[PDB]
Every structure is written in structure tokens, then in C-alpha cells.
Symmetry: C3
Subunit: 315 residues, 3 copies
């Protein structure tokens, strides 16, 4: 068995060895839980961003940064791949756990999900459950969790609070930008399962996605980081059997596609904050069908929307 919590815990332990290099800071709480600040009150780093992503993917993925250009403008990009996309992306990475402890709220991502079984149906659909006595969660938040939050996470995971780790970074931070574009494979996997395709048919996935510049607040960053994937995220996927339904994976097949997501979200304040869930999806995919030996291409890139998203100013 592959234990996403045990594998990710090793990477957290590595982060703990290089805190200053990585520009992160941890604290051991009075109940023994370890809270790793990756960008709330510290700058974080590109490499902290990478490691946060690897942790989110339960250590079952390759994640690297390469610098390249869009229409000549240079950006850092995530390039990543995994041969365990159902476990890495659905059973671990997806921010699928609503943590609510009195007044704290955060969406939880990462290996701890596979212990708490959050949400229940995901683990049934992918046929995975972790068995570990360590739990590792990643939180996107502008506040660090305290002893009571960590206690709750540990009880939900059936682990002692001394054996729980949390990585935390806000949306608008380097680690936020890296870890969100680092979801490019996930967006594909999750959208495929959402439209009815069995994620157990997915053999592997490989993805490229620009890392958003850091915008001036968490709400703008929510927009540009989602946009990295929706307008400029590319995925090569391998599956056992193709289904024609996969034409509906790309975000351009959503009624809500066309503007930066920040603009979509602002416009929705006037309609009960409702937005097509299918919008959250990769820009372009190629699907290599093992049955027929054909590779079906769907979607499109959109540098023009991306540059609006990114608040690019040209001369």
C-alpha cells in the first residue's frame, strides 16, 4: 500500500530542516501538533511552494518549476506528472474537507483527507483509504490554526495530536500561487469525475500551468490563480477507455467561461453567488486512449484573458 500521510510526512520533515532557506517558520503547539507557516507571517519561497504541492499530492507526484514565456512575457511555470492521479489528486490534493471548529473555518487539502475520509463518497469512488498514525493537512488561509483546530483534525483522522502537521499559506502568497497552479492535473481529474467519468480508468496525467503573479489581496489572487488553470493550463492524460463525454472537460465548455474568474465572482454577487461548477477545469487537454490508441484533443489556451487576469501592464 502507498500511504499518502507517511510519504508526505517525510517531505514535511525535510521542510523543517531548511526553514530559513525556505523562508518558512514552524511552531510546536502545547498538544504537540506542528503548524508550519508557509506564507501567513513569513514570505515562503518557490521551493516551499513546490514542497507544499508535493505534500498535497501525497508525495505521489513530480513537481518542478521551469521559466518560459507567453507571448514573450516570462513566467515561472509548474510542470508536474503523476502515475497515481486518482489517489494523488482526488484522495489527497483536492481541497475537499470543510474544517469548521466553532469560529475557525478553512478548506482542508492533502493527505489527512484520506484518514478522515472527507468527503465520504470520494474514497468509495477511488477505492482508497490510508492507514497511518501521522496526518498531514494543507490549509489555504490567512490565519494559523491553534491547538483546538489541530485537536479536531487529529480526532477526525484518529491520530494523536502530537502526530499531526499543518502547512498553511494564504491565496495571495508565493506558496499560494505555486500550489494552486500545481493543481493543474487535479483540475482535470476532478472535472472528469464530476461529469461522470470513472477516475479508476485514469492511468496517469502530466500538466503545465503558469504560476500567477501575486495580486494585491486574497480575493484578486483567488481569481488569477484559478485563471492560471482555466485559461492557460494544459494536461496530457492517459486513460484505459475513452468516453465521448470527455469533450466537456475543458473550462471553455462552461456557460460561465470567458472572463477572468475575479470578474465572474464579482458579477455573481448580484445573483446569489452562483457559478457553473464545471467552469473549474483545465484550459486544454489531450487524452491518450489505450483502447483505440487515439489521442483526443479538447479545449484551448487564452493568453488574452490570462494577461487581463494577471494585471499585466505592457509598454
Amino acid at each position: 500500500m502507498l500511504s499518502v500521510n507517511e510519504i508526505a510526512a517525510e517531505i514535511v520533515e525535510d521542510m523543517l530542516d531548511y526553514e530559513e532557506e525556505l523562508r518558512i517558520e514552524s511552531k510546536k503547539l502545547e498538544n504537540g501538533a506542528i503548524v508550519v507557516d508557509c506564507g501567513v507571517n513569513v514570505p515562503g519561497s518557490y521551493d516551499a511552494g513546490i514542497m507544499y504541492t508535493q505534500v498535497c499530492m501525497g508525495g505521489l507526484a513530480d513537481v518542478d518549476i521551469v521559466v518560459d514565456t507567453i507571448n514573450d512575457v516570462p513566467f515561472a511555470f509548474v510542470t508536474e506528472y503523476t502515475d497515481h492521479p486518482a489517489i494523488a489528486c482526488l484522495g489527497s490534493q483536492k481541497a475537499g474537507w470543510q474544517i469548521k471548529v466553532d469560529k475557525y473555518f478553512a478548506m482542508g487539502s492533502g493527505p489527512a483527507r484520506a484518514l478522515a475520509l472527507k468527503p465520504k463518497k470520494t474514497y468509495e469512488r477511488i477505492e482508497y483509504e490510508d492507514d497511518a498514525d501521522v496526518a498531514v493537512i494543507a490549509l489555504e488561509a490567512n490565519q494559523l490554526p491553534d491547538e483546538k483546530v489541530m485537536e479536531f483534525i487529529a480526532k477526525e483522522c484518529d491520530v494523536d495530536p502530537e502526530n499531526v502537521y499543518a502547512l498553511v499559506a494564504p491565496t495571495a502568497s508565493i506558496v499560494g500561487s505555486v500550489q494552486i497552479s500545481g493543481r493543474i492535473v487535479q483540475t482535470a481529474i476532478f472535472k472528469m469525475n464530476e461529469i461522470g467519468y470513472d477516475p479508476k480508468l485514469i492511468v496517469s496525467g502530466a500538466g503545465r500551468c503558469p504560476i500567477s503573479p501575486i495580486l494585491e489581496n486574497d480575493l484578486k489572487a483567488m481569481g488569477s490563480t484559478n485563471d492560471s488553470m482555466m485559461y492557460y493550463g494544459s494536461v496530457f492524460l492517459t486513460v484505459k477507455k475513452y468516453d465521448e463525454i470527455l469533450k466537456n472537460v475543458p473550462s471553455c465548455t462552461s456557460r460561465d467561461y470567458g472572463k477572468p474568474f475575479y470578474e465572474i465572482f464579482k458579477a455573481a454577487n448580484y445573483d446569489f453567488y452562483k457559478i457553473d461548477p464545471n467552469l473549474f477545469a483545465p484550459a486544454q487537454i489531450a487524452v491518450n486512449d489505450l483502447e483505440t490508441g487515439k489521442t483526443y484533443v479538447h479545449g484551448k489556451l487564452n493568453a488574452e484573458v490570462l494577461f487581463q487576469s494577471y494585471q499585466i501592464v505592457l509598454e
Copy 2:
């Protein structure tokens, strides 16, 4: 001295530590030989593909995967380089050892070739021979070799069978796609030597090549993996002294160039050749000549043929 077998054996031991993660499986045979299935009865993985390639290159190259686009369509790519091209590519990686042990027949690649001296003339040309008590062979085949096959390989290498490793993957597998695109440097070096250029004059080489989707059988995969290098593989090379003959390195200088190789292979009826041997060659090269300080560029990319080879289906 650099021992391609000893260096590669360290890589194989690493594979053995991460079998489940890499989606491979090994067996230690009665005679002690270690046989590592990388894609016959197991899925393998992008990372097993990289390690298989590193092993073929006698651990004397860098091999990585980077996601990128061809006419907007995303693919995984091999990016690779080596400062021992003669030894890594000709003395090791090239599939130059025909293994036929009555019923079992495979083409053998990798460091074992440098103990068995297969073929003889290669090792005289590059002035290399390995001295090691361990042998590592990579087999492109759809069956795992038994005690008798490994005893044959051991004997040819003058190594006890308990000190022999074999990596095995079929042509149509992820390891097959990665490892064959991984020969991008090798194809250039091999073609250079074939047209009479002394490979001992080659200082280093760096290459990029897309990783073929997996087609529906080994025969179709033979075509598309080869096409990756012939129609879309690029190599930057450094040489001590340039020769005008190097203009005939690229595949497009062959009389047989122009159709997906599968069509070429079963359009002159055969199961080889006359097919022009010179066809097996990189698409495009830049050769930096240390003597004159100039860099000569030859060849061209053909995405149109690659997309045919790859059985791409656009909307």
C-alpha cells in the same frame, strides 16, 4: 575509470526500493538474477521510464521530463544531456545486442553490452570496455526472461547470474514511450558514426523529444516512438572538429523520409529492410564546432507527420 554497469546497478537498486510507487515489480530468480518488470504485466510509470533511460545511458546522463506544447497540444517531453556521449550512447544505450535464446528473442540495450562487447566493432571504435562483477541489461520485449535467458546473458558478460539485473518493458507501454524518446541524443550519435564521423570527436550532446502516446499494439508503437525522434527530436551537439558530411545526419536527408514510419515499415512490405538505415536519425541538429567556433544547423521539425504518427484526433 567510469563503470557503466556499476553506476547503473546503483540506479536499479533505487528502483527496487520504490517498486509500488514506480508501478514496477521485480523477482529474484533461483540463480540469484534480478528481473525487474517495468511494463509487461505492470503499468510502469513516467519515473520508471526516466530510471530505465538513465540505466540504458549507464548513469552517465541527465534525464528529465518537462510538459510543453506542439501546436498548442500538450505532451510530456524528454529533456536530456550527457558529457559522455560515446560511452553513454554507443557503448551502452544503443539497442545493439540481439538476444536470441531459442524461444526468447529480445533486442538488448544498456551497460551489459559493454561487458559482452556487443557488437565487437563499437567498443573498438569508442575505445571503451567495462570491467565489473555486475551486469545491467535493458530488454525491449513483451515477455520476462527466465533463469536460462539470464544465465546466457551472465555468461556472455563473464558475470555470475546472481550479479545480473534485467529491466524489461514492451514497446507499447509508458516506459517504452519514455525510454525510446530518451534515445534522442543516441540517435544523433549513432547516425553520426554510421555516416563515418569519428564518435570520439564528440564532446557532449543535449536533446529534446516528445514522449509518444501509447498506441494500440507494439507494432504501431514501434512507429510512433521512432517518429518522435525522426519528425520532432532536436539535438544540440558539441564536437572537436566539424565535417561537412554532418549535413546528412537529419532524417529528412533519407530517401525514405516523409511518412509516419509505421507506413514506411509496412509499405515496403517488410519487417525491415531495404528501408534506408539512415532514416533512423534525429529531425534537427545544431553542431557547435570547437575548431572554428561556428554552430551548424541541419534538419527540420514536422508536427504534421508527428500528429499523424500519434493518431491525434482534433475536434
Copy 3:
């Protein structure tokens, strides 16, 4: 505290463990100094080039090579990033120490600069000084340093000569090409400071730059290596507050921009005092401002001049 000397010493120790593989040679002098030839009387290698660069950047950066294309022609590229740009690039990588010991001339880069404080004002500007009893220097020289040269470096750094390491390569070598394209982030950071922008405001930098072919002598190589960055070097940087003056970062804003540096230098009668110092600068930058959330783009790529510089011969 981050000690650039102690961190870089670990990398040098890793180089010493793989000399034959990296094609380098070291010698321990009679005073105990360790001189590592990366390219004077040995070929060096792509990997020795990467480690040389990592050392120049005090172990505080990531540096990798990818193969990609410029107008179809393949080159090896450096991709790199750092979350300590002031220390890694100003405090360490910049070749800011002029060494003259009798008739021996060398340019000193890397972590020993942060002990000798060469030049004084840089360390005041970035508010960094190292404390280490090991010194690590990188020398761009066409001759290996002897006992007397190493004694001078040791005394300037207040270290015992037995605790000094030097890496050495000439401009025209693979290491020299890799390491100079390896200065792509540095050239942006240095240029910023030179035009009056406080390097303490710079959060991080990421850059890409092609690696020059090796030209026929050090003079030519000085030209093509510089041109790599000036004509085809791209950087994405993040800063605390923008300043309109950053429009003047790219080389194209220099009065001397436009032809290969070798031609500029010849036309100046080999006198840098006759060349605009603001020429030494990246080709194109994108500057993400944390204050406004905007990303400002400046500069341009120039493949035509690059290909002249590189002494490219097309068919």
C-alpha cells in the same frame, strides 16, 4: 543566519566526489588550498557548470538545464530561481572582486566575496556579511591559481589557506557558458541596483537564458556569453513596491545596444570605460509589484542578433 560559504562548501564537496563523471580535476596545494579545475586543462561538463553556478549563488538558488528551441534551432537553456536574490546575486554571484596577484589576473565571484567584503558598499547596501571559517571562490581565469594567489585570497577573507576552495574555468568552456548564462537573474538584480532601486525591496527572481555555444577563444566567448543574457535572457521578478525607473532595466534601453557584444567591445578598443555600463542587463523582464498587484513588462528578445553572436550557420 544563512552562510553562503558553508552552504556552497557542501556543493564543492559533492563535486569532489564525482570528478571523473563531471570531467573536473582538483589539486590540494602545499598550503592546503583546494583548487578545482572546471575547465582550464579539463573539459568540465554541463553538470559541473550547474554546480559552479549553484556555488556562485551561495547554494541559495535552484539551477537546471532544459533543452528547447529558438526559431526551431535547439539550444540548452538555464532555468533558475531564487528567494534570496540580494544575497545570492549581489552578495555572492556577481563577479565583484578584481584579483591581481603579481601577473596573475582573475575575476572573483561567489561566497568568499561575502567574507572579504568585495566591494564594501554592496554589503552595506544588502545588509549581509557572512561569518564562516571556510571560503569558497569561483574564478573566471585562463590559468589555475597557485599557492601565492590562494594565500592572498585566504588572507583577504581572514580564513586559513587550508580552508579555501576555488572553482576555476575560462570564458570559452562549457562551464564558462553555463555559468555566465546562469547569471540571468543576477544581471537583472545588479542592473536594478545600479539604476538606484533598493535591492532590499526585491522578493525573488526567476530566469531563463540560452547557453552559448563555445566560441573559438575567450574574447569571442566573452561576447556570446554576455549576448545570451543581453539579447535572449528573460526574468520574472517580484518586488515590494514598483518604481517607474525599472523601465530602464533592459539592455535595449542602453545607447550601446544593438550589435553582438564582441563588435561593441572591438569598436571600443577593448576598453570597458568606453561602453555604457547599463548595457550589461537582461533582454526582457516582467516585474510583479506586490503593492499595486500589477506586473510590468519591459524589454524584448532578439534572436537575429543572438544568431549573429552565436556564429550560427544555416543551410
